[PDB]
Amino acid sequence: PNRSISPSALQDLLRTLKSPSSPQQQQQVLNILKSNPQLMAAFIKQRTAKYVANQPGMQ
Amino acid sequence: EGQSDERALLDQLHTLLSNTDATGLEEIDRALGIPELVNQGQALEPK
Numbered sequence A: 001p002n003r004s005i006s007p008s009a010l011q012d013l014l015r016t017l018k019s020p021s022s023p024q025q026q027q028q029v030l031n032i033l034k035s036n037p038q039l040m041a042a043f044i045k046q047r048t049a050k051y052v053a054n055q056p057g058m059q
Numbered sequence B: 001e002g003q004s005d006e007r008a009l010l011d012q013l014h015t016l017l018s019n020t021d022a023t024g025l026e027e028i029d030r031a032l033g034i035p036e037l038v039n040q041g042q043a044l045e046p047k
Helices: A007-019 A028-033 A037-052 B005-016 B025-030 B034-040
Strands: none
Touching: A007 A028, A007 B005, A028 A037, A028 B025, A037 B005, A037 B025, A037 B034, B025 B034
């Protein structure tokens, strides 16, 4: 996790959401999320994008 | 980096992590203030 920053999270953050967020409901997502900063920002960006595409209000 | 395998594995990982939703992802979003960042317009920013 150096060339690609998430190649470990490619197993563990992947299985952390492939195994659903019911037994995976906890901050165990958030604890692997932080590892690749671009994945973290891409999460925050597309999370926000998914929301404005559902509940924009004025944005 | 050389965003090649890093790009492709980032793409599939942010696709998983934003595939619509996940039932505890609501907490992960509010733990990052994301439902507030919505009304701030953060989705519309290039950064």
